[PDB]
Amino acid sequence: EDYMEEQIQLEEQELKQKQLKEAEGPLPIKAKPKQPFLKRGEGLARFTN
Amino acid sequence: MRECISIHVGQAGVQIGNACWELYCLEHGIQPDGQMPSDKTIGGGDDSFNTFFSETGAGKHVPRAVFVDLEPTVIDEVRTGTYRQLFHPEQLITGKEDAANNYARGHYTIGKEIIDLVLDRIRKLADQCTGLQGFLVFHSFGGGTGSGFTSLLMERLSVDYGKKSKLEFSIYPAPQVSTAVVEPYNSILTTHTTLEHSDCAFMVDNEAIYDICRRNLDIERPTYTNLNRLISQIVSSITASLRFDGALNVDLTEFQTNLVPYPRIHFPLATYAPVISAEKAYHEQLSVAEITNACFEPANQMVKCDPRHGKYMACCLLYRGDVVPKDVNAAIATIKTKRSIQFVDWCPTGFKVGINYQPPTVVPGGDLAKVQRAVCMLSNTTAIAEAWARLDHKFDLMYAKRAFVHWYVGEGMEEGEFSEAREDMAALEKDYEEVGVDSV
Amino acid sequence: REIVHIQAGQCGNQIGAKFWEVISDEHGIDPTGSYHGDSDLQLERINVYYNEATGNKYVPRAILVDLEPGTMDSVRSGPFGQIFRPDNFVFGQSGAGNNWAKGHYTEGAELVDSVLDVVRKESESCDCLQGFQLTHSLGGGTGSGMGTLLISKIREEYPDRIMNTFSVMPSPKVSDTVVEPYNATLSVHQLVENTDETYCIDNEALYDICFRTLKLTTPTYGDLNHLVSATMSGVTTCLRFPGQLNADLRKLAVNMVPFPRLHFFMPGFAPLTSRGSQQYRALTVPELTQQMFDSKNMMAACDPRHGRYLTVAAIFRGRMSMKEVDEQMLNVQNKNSSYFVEWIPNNVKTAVCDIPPRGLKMSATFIGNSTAIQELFKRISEQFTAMFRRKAFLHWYTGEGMDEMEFTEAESNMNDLVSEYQQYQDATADEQG
Amino acid sequence: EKVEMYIKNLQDDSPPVRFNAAVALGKIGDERAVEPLIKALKDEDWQVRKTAAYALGKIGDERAVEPLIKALKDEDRYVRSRAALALGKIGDERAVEPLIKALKDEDEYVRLSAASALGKIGGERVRAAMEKLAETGTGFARKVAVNYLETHKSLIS
Amino acid sequence: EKVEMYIKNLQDDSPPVRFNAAVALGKIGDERAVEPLIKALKDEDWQVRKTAAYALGKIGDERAVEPLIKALKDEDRYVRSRAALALGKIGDERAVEPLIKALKDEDEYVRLSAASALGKIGGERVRAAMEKLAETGTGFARKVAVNYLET
Ligand SMILES: Nc1nc2c(ncn2[C@@H]2O[C@H](COP(=O)(O)OP(=O)(O)OP(=O)(O)O)[C@@H](O)[C@H]2O)c(=O)[nH]1
Ligand SMILES: Nc1nc2c(ncn2[C@@H]2O[C@H](COP(=O)(O)OP(=O)(O)OP(=O)(O)O)[C@@H](O)[C@H]2O)c(=O)[nH]1
Ligand SMILES: [Mg+2]
Ligand SMILES: [Mg+2]
């Protein structure tokens, strides 16, 4: 997997230049919507009723 | 007359049920259009078939039967068959989706919807009865409909027909024809909840039938068609006392009087003989002495077990055909002279006998051949607990891991019902051991 | 009776299209939709996957979905592309580019309601719908991400229905996409909770069968897909033709799934063929048995010898001796008794269809719930931990509103699946208390 | 021509053989078989005695009246009741008084067969007997008499 | 020779070999076993008192009569049954009246064991109890009553 580490470091170098310009937002810094998700043990509600 | 209503539940009960009626028609001379004409009629004045067959105002004899299944496939084959004319449309009740081999689904989820409709069509048959005796329930132990819906129906029937007797014919599971892994769960669950609502249960061990098919009928790999032809031949000899003029097991109560010592131990063992392959019918026929001795060979039992590993409580021999009463008396006296046939100390040691002189009947174009004389021995041996032991071992094997238990709880049942049903089988097995434990 | 089929993404529509090509040949249905076969058995259970129309012109009950607009076009130009319902094609404006978050939360979650409406218009015309059948892959964003969103949304609208899936596993020897273990772990978390039965079709196993067994030096998707066609056609025989055992999705789930979460099946097929295999000879029942149970014939990169089977289903196809099948199937359990859990007696069920597969005179299909499937989930956990440790490409997912705690849930549930799978592998049939 | 065979069989040492013969004799229904079927009514095996009673009704010869009347006092329930049904088929009013006594029988089928036989006979002899029975008779026999008179009323009361 | 091992195993604080002791004492049969098998009919365990009845029943001693009659008014059904059947095997006529009191028992199986045992004595008081049972008894118990009366 030599192509694997070559893409990980490319993403690290590309996400450092992209975040250099994208870190100057406006007005009250409101947080970005953290999405709810499936939590472990939720699919076991069918076999309890 | 003194009528009996047959209720067939699930695929197995429906399938065995139709094969029984096919034989009943041949025995009593009824054609597949309800007609009983001069030609096919028996004569002799035997009108005892009128307990199983109602009559329209046009000599049409209609079975007092109810067929129930939570799916159409099995009952659609009835309304499209040879006997599609024999039963009234309302006697065949079908659902849209089955109980998927889950007891809880038939007893609770799906079953609760078709239960009240079934009581209605049963009441409609019970209404044409001047003196209803009770019910004959044919069903499998392993089916979702067979185990669950039957259990539900028996609970209801006790409420709606208190004074009436309930007698079952239960297909006990075989690995060679098993449809589901949960078959032991369903069998223990149905037996527990049905135990107080049933007065006499005749288990039909499918492995025992498969074994007879392989050995006696020379069938390498018998289909359900093969198994069904044999089970009807046996179940018909058990119910013939109810549909013919006789002196033994004349009515439903007599089954309990002659076979059930006390209510819980209501599982008699049927041993039918002779079972002869069609290719071997033109050999000198077996005598009354030969076929009486065959009832004591476990190879011919309808449930796999060894009666020699237990004790007897009751024994009824129901002969049919060219049986001379004096020969039966000699054969019985020979049996009585056997130290291996042991009765419990608290039960009377005897053999009740009945001979129907009408020649025995087989389905033409079938793996079974016509004999001059045959017998069915209905015995209540404490060795029938061997059959429960096999189920309880496989039940404890999975319940210790809670395997598949989720499918049941998610379908309106509680986990404690499995603990509850198994405590009943431990109580039953310990009881069977504790009564056949001694004699001198 | 009826099954609603859904195919999401490139892989979903590729395996899914080959499914309808094979089963329509076995059922006598030509590309126009009308029947042209010989046996009356072909049409007996047609209503399961088809809808009758005009003058008995059979239409597949399929819903074709993909965010890539081009996938709709490649399906229509296939052999049976003129047999699908034109309204059942729900296709987006651009694919997710192997980003699960796009499909489950943003781009895919916009298209979901449109698909649900099509699901409804097909579930409404069911006399008695039995469940759903999703064909997709966990490697990309659409089939894996949007596919698992269709699953939850369907499970909240049809809670008493069977969710059956054909889920394709990522392998680094099939696809160069570094983010595939992230999507596979995120989809497996959804599958574990919302599916009733999942057929783990491992691309690692298909690449290996083609290279090692079939000797195909340069395997293509068409050669990998041929194995999937044989498998999907085999595993579904039970519901497509009149039978006694495992004849519906629910009865199949009751016989195969002992534990709610342990519903991941390792399929298998015998014999292994590749498009154009002229030189061949009919296989005997003993050959089909030994092959069908062997790791060489497995559609999941696991060895069932490094585990135990909880349940198994064998489907034999062709005019063969029903006593010989029974003998072989008993001998397999009675010899290899050390590979089956003793606390589940009679766990292997055997069905026989008289109608054999396309071109073949005889075949066997294996469906096994083996604890050795943990060897597939350990592969995805090692590959996922490799990336999640250095925190590679997390912005790609969280940027679409996705929570980082969801990667931790997906990981902690897949490890729990492996620990549950091993607790039952080392479980003893004992009464100690 | 086969009647010759079933007549000799009627007294064969084997009870199933005499039974099968009495069954066939009723199916044939001949004058020649009347006397041997009258002898069959005194057979020690009830299954043979009951079959003779039916056979004597299907043939329906006056000669069977006196022997079938004495079968209503038989120890066997199927012989008493199956003989009453033959007396109803023959219709000879000699059966009327013996049939009224069978209405107080222990077995229900015999009681039911006797009432159905009284109804099959009819005539002024049964009518007069039922008018009296609905006064000096009690329970079931009273019920049979009141039903008889009501089902045979020529007017709407 | 080794009959004294089971002879003192009735007063054992451990119940497993205590029940096993009466199972071998009754099969061998010694004149010393008459006394300790009576003390086994006053236990807290049902398997002990019921195995004592079968051991004392095989050894047909009158010393068993007096305590075996008290075992018919037991809290268990299996003890009562083997104790009634032991009285039938020994034959003491004083056990007739208490066996008739067992025919109107809660347990339908105790009533059948008592009837079997009362039939084994076959006295003249038994003849009236069996004529009564042939009218005031369940379908199976009324059939036991008429099979004995056919003598
Ligand atoms: N002898 C015999 N046994 C049968 C037949 N059909 C099924 N069985 C047995 O019965 C058991 C399964 O029960 P089924 O009768 O098929 O099921 P059901 O009552 O319809 O219940 P569900 O289909 O689950 O709703 C297994 O032991 C079968 O092998 C048949 O026609 N004959
Ligand atoms: N066996 C098989 N795998 C396929 C096929 N096409 C794609 N794959 C696999 O599917 C995974 C990638 O997911 P895709 O289905 O191509 O992507 P998608 O579902 O369209 O989602 P997006 O790429 O995000 O639009 C990888 O594991 C591929 O090797 C096919 O026809 N057969
Ligand atoms: Mg069924
Ligand atoms: Mg794509």
Side-chain angles (χ1 to χ4, degrees), chain C residues 133-150:
Chain C
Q133 170 183 282
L134 176 68
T135 84
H136 70 139
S137 62
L138 320 191
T142 300
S144 78
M146 184 180 170
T148 49
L149 183 72
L150 285 161

mmCIF file of all heavy atoms in Angstrom, chain C residues 133-150:
data_model
loop_
_atom_site.group_PDB
_atom_site.id
_atom_site.type_symbol
_atom_site.label_atom_id
_atom_site.label_comp_id
_atom_site.label_asym_id
_atom_site.label_seq_id
_atom_site.Cartn_x
_atom_site.Cartn_y
_atom_site.Cartn_z
ATOM 1 N N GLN C 133 -35.271 -6.074 -0.718
ATOM 2 C CA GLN C 133 -34.013 -6.699 -1.122
ATOM 3 C C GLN C 133 -33.097 -5.653 -1.752
ATOM 4 O O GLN C 133 -33.287 -5.270 -2.905
ATOM 5 C CB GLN C 133 -34.300 -7.851 -2.081
ATOM 6 C CG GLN C 133 -33.093 -8.430 -2.758
ATOM 7 C CD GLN C 133 -33.512 -9.498 -3.724
ATOM 8 O OE1 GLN C 133 -33.826 -10.644 -3.330
ATOM 9 N NE2 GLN C 133 -33.523 -9.139 -5.012
ATOM 10 N N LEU C 134 -32.114 -5.173 -0.992
ATOM 11 C CA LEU C 134 -31.208 -4.138 -1.464
ATOM 12 C C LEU C 134 -29.878 -4.670 -1.969
ATOM 13 O O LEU C 134 -29.126 -5.246 -1.199
ATOM 14 C CB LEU C 134 -30.962 -3.140 -0.320
ATOM 15 C CG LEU C 134 -29.961 -2.021 -0.565
ATOM 16 C CD1 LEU C 134 -30.482 -1.055 -1.584
ATOM 17 C CD2 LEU C 134 -29.678 -1.273 0.708
ATOM 18 N N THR C 135 -29.552 -4.414 -3.235
ATOM 19 C CA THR C 135 -28.247 -4.766 -3.803
ATOM 20 C C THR C 135 -27.416 -3.443 -3.882
ATOM 21 O O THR C 135 -27.877 -2.463 -4.445
ATOM 22 C CB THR C 135 -28.377 -5.536 -5.153
ATOM 23 O OG1 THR C 135 -28.542 -4.630 -6.260
ATOM 24 C CG2 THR C 135 -29.488 -6.573 -5.140
ATOM 25 N N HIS C 136 -26.216 -3.425 -3.294
ATOM 26 C CA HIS C 136 -25.350 -2.240 -3.227
ATOM 27 C C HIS C 136 -23.919 -2.657 -2.752
ATOM 28 O O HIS C 136 -23.714 -3.812 -2.374
ATOM 29 C CB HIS C 136 -25.961 -1.264 -2.195
ATOM 30 C CG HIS C 136 -25.856 -1.758 -0.779
ATOM 31 N ND1 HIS C 136 -25.536 -0.908 0.254
ATOM 32 C CD2 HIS C 136 -25.949 -3.015 -0.288
ATOM 33 C CE1 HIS C 136 -25.497 -1.658 1.341
ATOM 34 N NE2 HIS C 136 -25.701 -2.935 1.055
ATOM 35 N N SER C 137 -22.969 -1.712 -2.692
ATOM 36 C CA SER C 137 -21.627 -1.955 -2.162
ATOM 37 C C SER C 137 -21.325 -0.960 -1.059
ATOM 38 O O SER C 137 -21.777 0.175 -1.116
ATOM 39 C CB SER C 137 -20.560 -1.813 -3.239
ATOM 40 O OG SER C 137 -20.551 -0.495 -3.747
ATOM 41 N N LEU C 138 -20.501 -1.351 -0.107
ATOM 42 C CA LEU C 138 -20.128 -0.492 1.011
ATOM 43 C C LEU C 138 -18.884 0.358 0.746
ATOM 44 O O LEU C 138 -18.546 1.187 1.579
ATOM 45 C CB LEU C 138 -19.931 -1.333 2.295
ATOM 46 C CG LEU C 138 -20.919 -2.495 2.583
ATOM 47 C CD1 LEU C 138 -20.734 -2.994 3.977
ATOM 48 C CD2 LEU C 138 -22.361 -2.057 2.434
ATOM 49 N N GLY C 139 -18.229 0.173 -0.400
ATOM 50 C CA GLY C 139 -17.032 0.916 -0.759
ATOM 51 C C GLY C 139 -17.214 2.379 -1.121
ATOM 52 O O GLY C 139 -16.345 3.198 -0.807
ATOM 53 N N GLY C 140 -18.308 2.728 -1.800
ATOM 54 C CA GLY C 140 -18.522 4.105 -2.245
ATOM 55 C C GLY C 140 -19.415 4.947 -1.352
ATOM 56 O O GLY C 140 -19.563 4.654 -0.170
ATOM 57 N N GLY C 141 -20.003 6.000 -1.909
ATOM 58 C CA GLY C 141 -20.887 6.881 -1.156
ATOM 59 C C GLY C 141 -22.374 6.652 -1.384
ATOM 60 O O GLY C 141 -23.156 6.750 -0.439
ATOM 61 N N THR C 142 -22.796 6.367 -2.630
ATOM 62 C CA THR C 142 -24.222 6.180 -2.947
ATOM 63 C C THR C 142 -24.789 4.835 -2.428
ATOM 64 O O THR C 142 -25.660 4.833 -1.559
ATOM 65 C CB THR C 142 -24.521 6.387 -4.458
ATOM 66 O OG1 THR C 142 -24.168 7.711 -4.887
ATOM 67 C CG2 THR C 142 -25.958 6.081 -4.805
ATOM 68 N N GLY C 143 -24.288 3.703 -2.931
ATOM 69 C CA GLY C 143 -24.773 2.397 -2.525
ATOM 70 C C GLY C 143 -24.612 2.186 -1.042
ATOM 71 O O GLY C 143 -25.563 1.781 -0.367
ATOM 72 N N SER C 144 -23.438 2.561 -0.513
ATOM 73 C CA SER C 144 -23.178 2.401 0.907
ATOM 74 C C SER C 144 -23.900 3.431 1.802
ATOM 75 O O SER C 144 -24.678 3.023 2.663
ATOM 76 C CB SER C 144 -21.684 2.364 1.189
ATOM 77 O OG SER C 144 -21.114 3.655 1.172
ATOM 78 N N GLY C 145 -23.689 4.727 1.567
ATOM 79 C CA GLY C 145 -24.270 5.800 2.372
ATOM 80 C C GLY C 145 -25.748 6.052 2.194
ATOM 81 O O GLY C 145 -26.476 6.169 3.184
ATOM 82 N N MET C 146 -26.195 6.226 0.940
ATOM 83 C CA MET C 146 -27.616 6.459 0.652
ATOM 84 C C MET C 146 -28.411 5.168 0.789
ATOM 85 O O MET C 146 -29.562 5.206 1.230
ATOM 86 C CB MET C 146 -27.834 7.069 -0.735
ATOM 87 C CG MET C 146 -29.282 7.396 -0.994
ATOM 88 S SD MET C 146 -29.623 8.127 -2.602
ATOM 89 C CE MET C 146 -31.400 8.048 -2.603
ATOM 90 N N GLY C 147 -27.784 4.034 0.452
ATOM 91 C CA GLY C 147 -28.369 2.716 0.604
ATOM 92 C C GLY C 147 -28.705 2.444 2.051
ATOM 93 O O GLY C 147 -29.824 2.023 2.333
ATOM 94 N N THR C 148 -27.783 2.760 2.989
ATOM 95 C CA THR C 148 -28.078 2.550 4.411
ATOM 96 C C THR C 148 -29.114 3.561 4.945
ATOM 97 O O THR C 148 -29.779 3.256 5.937
ATOM 98 C CB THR C 148 -26.830 2.463 5.281
ATOM 99 O OG1 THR C 148 -25.980 3.553 4.980
ATOM 100 C CG2 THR C 148 -26.091 1.162 5.103
ATOM 101 N N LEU C 149 -29.300 4.717 4.271
ATOM 102 C CA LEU C 149 -30.335 5.706 4.619
ATOM 103 C C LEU C 149 -31.702 5.199 4.163
ATOM 104 O O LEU C 149 -32.688 5.369 4.877
ATOM 105 C CB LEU C 149 -30.068 7.075 3.990
ATOM 106 C CG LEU C 149 -31.083 8.136 4.378
ATOM 107 C CD1 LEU C 149 -30.901 8.572 5.815
ATOM 108 C CD2 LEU C 149 -31.053 9.278 3.430
ATOM 109 N N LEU C 150 -31.768 4.541 2.995
ATOM 110 C CA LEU C 150 -33.010 3.926 2.531
ATOM 111 C C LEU C 150 -33.447 2.841 3.503
ATOM 112 O O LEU C 150 -34.617 2.757 3.812
ATOM 113 C CB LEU C 150 -32.820 3.320 1.146
ATOM 114 C CG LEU C 150 -32.765 4.348 0.046
ATOM 115 C CD1 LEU C 150 -32.133 3.770 -1.207
ATOM 116 C CD2 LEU C 150 -34.146 4.926 -0.212
#
